[PDB]
Amino acid sequence: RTVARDITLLECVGKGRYGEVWRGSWQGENVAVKIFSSRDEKSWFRETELYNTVMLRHENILGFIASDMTSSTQLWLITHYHEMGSLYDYLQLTTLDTVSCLRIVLSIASGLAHLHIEIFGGKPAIAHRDLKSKNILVKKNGQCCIADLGLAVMHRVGTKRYMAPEVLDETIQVDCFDSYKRVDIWAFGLVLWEVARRMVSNGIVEDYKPPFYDVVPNDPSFEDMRKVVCVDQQRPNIPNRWFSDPTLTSLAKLMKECWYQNPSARLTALRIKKTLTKID
Amino acid sequence: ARDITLLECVGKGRYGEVWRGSWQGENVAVKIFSSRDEKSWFRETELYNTRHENILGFIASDMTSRHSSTQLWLITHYHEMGSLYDYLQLTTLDTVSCLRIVLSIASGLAHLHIEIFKPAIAHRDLKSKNILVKKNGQCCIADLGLAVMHSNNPRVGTKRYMAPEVLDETIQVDCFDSYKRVDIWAFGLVLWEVARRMVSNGIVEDYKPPFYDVVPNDPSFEDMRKVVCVDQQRPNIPNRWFSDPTLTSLAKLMKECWYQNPSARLTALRIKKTLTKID
Ligand SMILES: COc1cc(-c2cncc(-c3ccc(C4CCN(C)CC4)cc3)c2C)cc(OC)c1OC
Ligand SMILES: COc1cc(-c2cncc(-c3ccc(C4CCN(C)CC4)cc3)c2C)cc(OC)c1OC
Ligand SMILES: COc1cc(-c2cncc(-c3ccc(C4CCN(C)CC4)cc3)c2C)cc(OC)c1OC
Ligand SMILES: COc1cc(-c2cncc(-c3ccc(C4CCN(C)CC4)cc3)c2C)cc(OC)c1OC
């Protein structure tokens, strides 16, 4: 039999330190091709090792197609393609209503709970370790999927803006898998804040801002972040207008329970999921 | 043109399957791994991320999945003439062919073993089936699925070729030098398999695998341990070899691969040097 490995690279939809993401075509089908830089080659190996250990298949987890190494060395990760792009891009120039806001955040919680839970007979527990709005893609059915398991760990390293206090102050209990779950929940709390801001209530909505936009520069340093999160113990602002909306009022409670300095006190993904199904 | 056509199965076993294929009008080899061997696929892909005339040449490595099923591919150059194990079955050697083969294996292994500033690599599964014969009469080493790097769970490769310290599980698991030493033991056995097939004074031995005479067919780990560790057996040197200067030199080399004390064994580089001195 023939094995069609020909993947046409049609347009570049991302270019960073990680390398490049291309919209590609394989047998008429849209695929996403991440071409890794030498800088980021370790992320190809860790993600490939993860998918070689457990083939994750979930609505809210970016769909794996292939890992390819070709002879210098070329490292490609091939996934399902989501034309609407990242949540980060989508929130820039889209507002939400109650239904579309809750659909996004419950799909993210569902993806994250699925990563975090050990399923027997099954999958190991997985912590993502780089959860942010850029690593969440928007699907046409209004649900989201979590992308980029390049830093993931199965039972410091992530984007500085989203790092939990225990990462920034190096108190993270590195011997405890639960520590990495708790770091994901912190970041989930920030993403929730970024989404809730874009949900309209009483004709009011906040403009898109990244977490801590008002207290750190662009490309905050480790020290910038540690002073805000660890020393001053600052948390993102909850606007007054949220307290006139029952949904944003319940989401405010939820995000604050993801932001405790004490990691053990934070909600679990499974608890967040239960709470989000009782909202509306 | 990334397209690959699978033309015919050249091998089938617990490791999976290997296929002669076409790719850009060139012959290639395509290994599709068994589910059992997924960790080897990943380890080999890591190794190949680190090129040499006597190492199986890498083209590509792929993990593919839809739904619950995964395929693991390794694409390499194709060697028409097959494995050394195959080649030795119904070919005899003269002095020049015999040394060319063993000097090329020693070169490949020296290249694996030596850090370039490429890490140091111990193969851990050296055997005639994991060596391929090139048209120029030289060989290349294949199968880095168990290979270890230096700038992991059980102690196991192919039973018949396992070093005494592997069979009695006294091997220094944390010492990289231990893994090089296991390669030299197995290389000694490959030297013996090859030398048996070199004609001297109108005499040649039939192809036999290491320990053919002293263990049951398809020997167990206990079987190998009994003969290597308890009975202290080594492959027999046919007396006819001692009439030949080359086979006399090779018999001396392979005994310096077979000391029970791993620290006593020659280095790949010393074997390369000695084989370069022999004519
Ligand atoms: C190697 O590389 C790539 C390959 C492919 C690709 C193209 N056609 C067919 C396949 C295929 C899948 C499964 C079987 C068999 C094997 C197991 N048996 C039990 C029955 C089923 C055969 C063939 C693949 C894997 C796509 C790629 O990209 C999307 C590849 O990467 C560039
Ligand atoms: C986070 O990480 C990964 C993401 C993806 C991925 C999958 N679908 C779609 C996209 C995408 C497409 C298009 C835009 C923009 C382009 C400009 N304008 C027209 C709006 C749209 C953004 C994003 C991406 C980036 C693939 C990956 O790997 C192959 C990723 O790495 C795991
Ligand atoms: C990697 O990606 C894609 C691959 C393919 C594809 C192409 N040929 C053959 C296959 C295949 C066939 C059969 C088995 C199984 C059947 C059950 N049992 C008997 C074991 C063997 C597995 C695999 C696939 C999955 C199609 C895709 O999309 C249409 C892919 O997505 C881009
Ligand atoms: C050991 O290891 C790997 C080997 C190879 C490989 C490369 N060239 C040629 C071959 C070959 C061709 C043909 C025969 C013939 C011999 C006589 N006849 C009765 C049976 C068939 C044998 C062997 C192979 C097996 C590829 C691999 O992966 C791509 C290997 O895995 C690392």
- How many inter-chain contacts (A to B, CB under 8 Å) are there? 68
Transcribe chain B into DSSP letters: ---EEEEEEEEEETTEEEEEEEETTEEEEEEEE-GGGHHHHHHHHHHHH---TTB--EEEEEEEEETTEEEEEEEEE--TT-BHHHHHHT--B-HHHHHHHHHHHHHHHHHHHS-----EEE-S--SGGGEEE-TTS-EEE---TT-EEE---S--S-GGG--HHHHTT-S-TT-HHHHHHHHHHHHHHHHHHHHTTB-BTTB-PPP--TTTTTS-SS--HHHHHIIIIIS---PPPPGGGGGSHHHHHHHHHHHTT--SSGGGSPPHHHHHHHHHH--
Residue A237 vs residues A167, A194, B221: alpha-carbon distances, Å: 22, 11, 66
Residue bearing tokens 């020693």: B106
Amino acid at position A164, single letter:
A
Q: How far apart (Å, rounded) are the C-alpha atoms in residues B121 and B51? A: 13
Catalytic residues of A: 130
Active-site residue, B213 included = no
Q: How is residue A116 written in tokens?
A: 């975090």
User: Are the CB atoms for B45 and B39 separated by under 8 Å?
Assistant: no
Q: Please report which helix (H) or strand (E) contains residue A210, including its range.
A: none
Candidates B4, B41, B59; nearest CB to A71:
B59
Q: Which of B37, B86, B125, B244 is catalytic?
A: B125
Resolution in angstroms for this experimental structure? 1.6
Q: How far apart (Å, rounded) are the C-alpha atoms in residues A195 and A246? A: 16
User: Are the CB atoms for B182 and B188 separated by under 8 Å?
Assistant: no
Residue B91: phi and psi, rounded to 5, are: -140, 135
Pocket of ligand 1 (CB under 6 A): A 3-5, 26, 65-66, 68, 78; B 2, 62, 64, 71, 73
Strand pairing report for B148-150 and B120-122: antiparallel
Q: How far apart (Å, rounded) are the C-alpha atoms in residues B122 and B175? A: 11
- Asked whether the beta carbons of residue A2 and residue B4 sit closer than 8 angstroms, the reply is yes
Q: How far apart (Å, rounded) are the C-alpha atoms in residues A131 and A113? A: 13
Amino acid at position B15, single letter:
Y
User: Are the CB atoms for B254 and B82 separated by under 8 Å?
Assistant: no
- Asked whether the beta carbons of residue A71 and residue B60 sit closer than 8 angstroms, the reply is yes
The one-character DSSP state at A189 is H
User: Are the CB atoms for A144 and A168 separated by under 8 Å?
Assistant: no
Q: Following CA atoms B89, B95, B99, B102 in sequence, which dihedral angle do they give, to the nearest 10 degrees?
A: 20
Contacts of B62 in chain A (CB under 8 A): 5, 66-69
Residue bearing tokens 């850090």: B115
Q: How far apart (Å, rounded) are the C-alpha atoms in residues B235 and A124? A: 47
B245-255 vs B176-195: helix crossing angle, rounded to 10? 150
- Experimental determination approach used: X-ray
Q: How is residue B260 written in tokens?
A: 């029970």
The one-character DSSP state at A239 is -
With b meaning 16 or more CB within 10 Å and e meaning fewer, what string describes A240-255?
Answer: eebeebebbebbbebb
Strand pairing report for B16-23 and B4-13: antiparallel
- Any idea what the Cα angle at residue A103 is, between residues A102 and A105, rounded to 5°? 65
Which of A220, A233, A263, A64 lies closest to A145 in space, CA to CA?
A64
Which residues in chain B are followed by a discontinuity, with C-to-N distance exceeding 2.5 angstroms? Answer: 50, 117, 151
Pocket of ligand 3 (CB under 6 A): A 26, 29, 65-66; B 64-66, 69
- Identify the sign of the CA torsion B203, B206, B207, B210: negative
Q: How far apart (Å, rounded) are the C-alpha atoms in residues A57 and B157? A: 34
Q: How is residue B26 written in tokens?
A: 């060139």
Q: Where are the alpha helices (DSSP H) in A139-256?
A: 165-168, 177-196, 222-226, 246-256
Residue A274 vs residues A97, A128, A271, A279: alpha-carbon distances, Å: 21, 21, 5, 9
Which of B243, B248, B252 lies closest to B270 in space, CA to CA?
B252
Contacts of A51 in chain B (CB under 8 A): 63, 65, 70
Task: List strand residue ranges (DSSP E) for chain A, in order.
Answer: 2-3, 8-16, 19-26, 29-36, 64-70, 74-80, 126-127, 136-138, 144-146, 153-154
The one-character DSSP state at A132 is S
Nearest residue of B to residue A66, measured between CA atoms: B64
Q: Is B121 exposed, middle or buried (0-12, 13-18, 19+ CB in 10 A)?
A: buried
- Interface-testing mutation among B58, B64, B144, with chain A (most A C-beta atoms within 10 A): B64
Ligand 2 centroid to residue A137 C-alpha, Å: 7
Nearest-neighbour CA in chain B from A150: distance (Å): 16
